[PDB]
Design a protein around this ligand. Structure first.
Ligand SMILES: *[C@@H]1O[C@H](CO)[C@@H](O)[C@H](O)[C@H]1NC(C)=O
Ligand SMILES: *[C@@H]1O[C@H](CO)[C@@H](O)[C@H](O)[C@H]1NC(C)=O
Ligand SMILES: *[C@@H]1O[C@H](CO)[C@@H](O)[C@H](O)[C@H]1NC(C)=O
Ligand SMILES: *[C@@H]1O[C@H](CO)[C@@H](O)[C@H](O)[C@H]1NC(C)=O
Ligand SMILES: *[C@@H]1O[C@H](CO)[C@@H](O)[C@H](O)[C@H]1NC(C)=O
Ligand SMILES: *[C@@H]1O[C@H](CO)[C@@H](O)[C@H](O)[C@H]1NC(C)=O
Ligand SMILES: *[C@@H]1O[C@H](CO)[C@@H](O)[C@H](O)[C@H]1NC(C)=O
Ligand SMILES: *[C@@H]1O[C@H](CO)[C@@H](O)[C@H](O)[C@H]1NC(C)=O
Ligand SMILES: *[C@@H]1O[C@H](CO)[C@@H](O)[C@H](O)[C@H]1NC(C)=O
Ligand SMILES: *[C@@H]1O[C@H](CO)[C@@H](O)[C@H](O)[C@H]1NC(C)=O
Lengths: 135, 177, 33, 135, 135
């Protein structure tokens, strides 16, 4: 995906391609089985990138936290979809609109989904207490 | 099995194969495994044998994985199986070298006789097919002789000996006066 | 093969380390005999 | 009992000083027999190993041609860790035994690395328990 | 464990030892209650290691993801064991075959277990939908 990250697919490959290259990125990195006096500064600048990679990585890989699947690579949410948002089915979805040209179709619900998602997380917290109010 | 032959005065070539083509460790060792010639990495261990004075090899070829072994100025005792054990197999050449001469040394006369002697190494059952400038196909074993030796017999004689599927040519020089 | 690695490190070291005036090294390219 | 010879570097004590090496014959220290006594004799006294210039390489087959040496006044000391030997063996032998020599570096620096075994980590580990999920 | 990682036990200590040093690594790091002009480059090289530690750390500490316990330090899977694999019980297991010499006993099921594990993860996904097909 051109960088240490974006590592769950290749551009132009439509959705299903990237979605499945998830597991093969896993399975491919699972087993593991001249230098100038001022190369210093290149190494240096080389450093940041990797850190920042992990940093952002977490930074929302973290805040998949309030989204209920931090750390991992694959959510499934619990919200009712609004056909007003995309109105498409997996067939054309995964095989077409090579994502970069996919999400622009929904460039606006970008935060409405975060809305509904954290909302259902709080929904779960509410039902956990409802269920615990007796035992 | 793959033999070689010599002429008691010649050299000879003996072959060693290698698939990595890389100059890996080979050693040349005779029947009961004395060390004769050995690749020790990038080096040749002139083994402790009868051949501490003679044997050799084209050295460049090793970085190709073809390791040779020569026996210069063969005498009948250098006649023995060898072995090359490059990585996991022990290719065996077998060298049965001999030589030959005639009885007459400098002086012959017309109507006289001459005989032959072939100095084979032990364990050999050869057959000497011998020639003449006059077409005297002396057909027999070791000791080839003829009761007729003439001025027309002048010129050397292409003598040959078959030791287990090969031969090698020979002078029998004939000079008068 | 750590030992081979040290080996090749050393061979790397030796040549800018040591300067052969005129090195007569051999070569052949495959042409069967 | 047998230093046959050949290329100087396998037999002779060949060691690097002044960048060059000291090449003698099989006359020194190479001789003694052992039935319950050695066989030699009995400060800096003597042993004649001299320098060459046109050396062979332990590295890749093929010659090399070094420089004329320095005027003089050199010295090299050492601390032998051990020795490199193979039986001058065979099947001609009757009850005397002889050892005889080394020129392959891959052990010349392996009397120092028998310990070192490089390994990855396989910090993912498997084991048995009685652990299984809800159905 | 010789490094920032491998931090859940000591070598030679058999399984149970390392398995329990897990929790005490936790409990021990819980509370928290000359320099040369070219030391630069050593610090530099010192850097990578720590990053790479976290990087690999995650990199499969991450892909414990498809294994259903990323991030953490201790799984319990949900698969039926094949006595053909080790046929041993916790007693000798944890007290013997100081792991390094443990897993070599199963150097081949290395990926069969990942097989069955991700397989049961997908099994859970399948049962979640079966269960949700009505409500
Ligand atoms: C892209 O086009 C090629 C045609 O050569 C096709 O084989 C490939 O499947 C297309 N990409 C996707 C994701 O379908
Ligand atoms: C989304 O769908 C729900 C029920 O399907 C509906 O109540 C809500 O108004 C919809 N919102 C949008 C923006 O379509
Ligand atoms: C929207 O979804 C409805 C669902 O019945 C479908 O019939 C219709 O074709 C869709 N329209 C568009 C523009 O996606
Ligand atoms: C993707 O779009 C192309 C044309 O734009 C269409 O032929 C194809 O069927 C679509 N993908 C699927 C899965 O139908
Ligand atoms: C969807 O996003 C685009 C972004 O340009 C915006 O213009 C559009 O108004 C959004 N949809 C609706 C219904 O407003
Ligand atoms: C290893 O042997 C030592 C004896 O020196 C013993 O104290 C220790 O318990 C053994 N290791 C384990 C993990 O039991
Ligand atoms: C593992 O066990 C299951 C049932 O316990 C069995 O069906 C399967 O064949 C076994 N496989 C191996 C490799 O032992
Ligand atoms: C294999 O497991 C069976 C189960 O009862 C046990 O009896 C047997 O001793 C085990 N054999 C080995 C070699 O672990
Ligand atoms: C581990 O093996 C040793 C020797 O085979 C034995 O003394 C010890 O009891 C074993 N461990 C267990 C838990 O039985
Ligand atoms: C188990 O792993 C070893 C590793 O050397 C391998 O040789 C063996 O074939 C594997 N078991 C089976 C049944 O193949």
């Amino acid at each position: 995906g051109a960088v240490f990250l974006g590592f769950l697919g290749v551009a132009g490959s439509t959705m299903g391609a990237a979605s499945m290259t998830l597991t093969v990125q896993a399975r491919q990195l699972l087993s593991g089985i001249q230098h100038l006096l001022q190369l210093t500064v290149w190494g240096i600048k080389q450093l940041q990138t990797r850190v920042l990679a992990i940093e952002r990585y977490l930074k929302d890989q973290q805040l998949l936290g309030i989204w209920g699947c931090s750390g991992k690579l694959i959510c499934c949410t619990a919200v009712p979809w609004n056909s007003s948002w995309s109105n498409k089915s997996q067939k054309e979805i995964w095989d077409n609109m090579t994502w970069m040209q996919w999400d622009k179709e929904i460039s606006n619900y970008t935060n409405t989904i975060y809305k509904l998602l954290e909302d259902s997380q709080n929904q779960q917290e509410s039902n956990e207490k409802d269920l615990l109010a007796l035992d | 099995k793959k033999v070689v032959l010599g002429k008691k005065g010649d050299t000879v070539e003996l072959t060693c194969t290698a698939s990595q083509k890389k100059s890996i460790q080979f050693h040349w060792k005779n029947s009961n495994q004395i060390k004769i010639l050995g690749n020790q990495g990038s080096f040749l261990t002139k083994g402790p044998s009868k051949l501490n004075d003679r044997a050799d090899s084209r050295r460049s070829l090793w970085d190709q994985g073809n390791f040779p072994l020569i026996i210069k100025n063969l005498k009948i005792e250098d006649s023995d199986t060898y072995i090359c054990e490059v990585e996991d197999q022990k290719e065996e050449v077998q060298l049965l070298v001999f030589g030959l001469t005639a009885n007459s040394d400098t002086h012959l006369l017309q109507g006289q006789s001459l005989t032959l002697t072939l100095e084979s190494p032990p364990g050999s059952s050869p057959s000497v097919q011998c020639r003449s400038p006059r077409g005297k196909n002396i057909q027999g074993g070791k000791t080839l002789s003829v009761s007729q030796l003439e001025l027309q017999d002048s010129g050397t004689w292409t003598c040959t000996v078959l030791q287990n599927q090969k031969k090698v040519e020979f002078k029998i020089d004939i000079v008068v006066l | 093969e750590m030992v081979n690695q040290m080996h090749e490190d050393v061979i790397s070291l030796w040549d800018q380390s040591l300067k052969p005036c005129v090195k007569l090294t051999p070569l052949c390219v495959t042409l069967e005999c | 009992t047998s230093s046959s010879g050949g290329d100087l570097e396998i037999t002779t004590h060949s060691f690097t000083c002044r960048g060059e090496f000291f090449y003698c014959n099989t006359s020194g220290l190479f001789n003694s027999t052992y039935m319950p006594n050695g066989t030699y004799l009995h400060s800096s006294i003597t042993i004649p190993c001299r320098i060459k210039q046109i050396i062979n390489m332990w590295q890749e087959v093929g010659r090399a041609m070094y420089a004329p040496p320095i005027e003089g006044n050199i010295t090299c000391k050492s601390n032998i860790t051990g020795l490199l030997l193979v039986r001058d063996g065979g099947t001609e032998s009757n009850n005397t035994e002889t050892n005889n020599g080394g020129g392959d570096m891959r052990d010349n620096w392996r009397s120092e690395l028998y310990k070192y075994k490089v390994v990855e980590i396989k910090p993912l580990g498997v084991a048995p328990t009685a652990c299984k999920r809800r159905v």
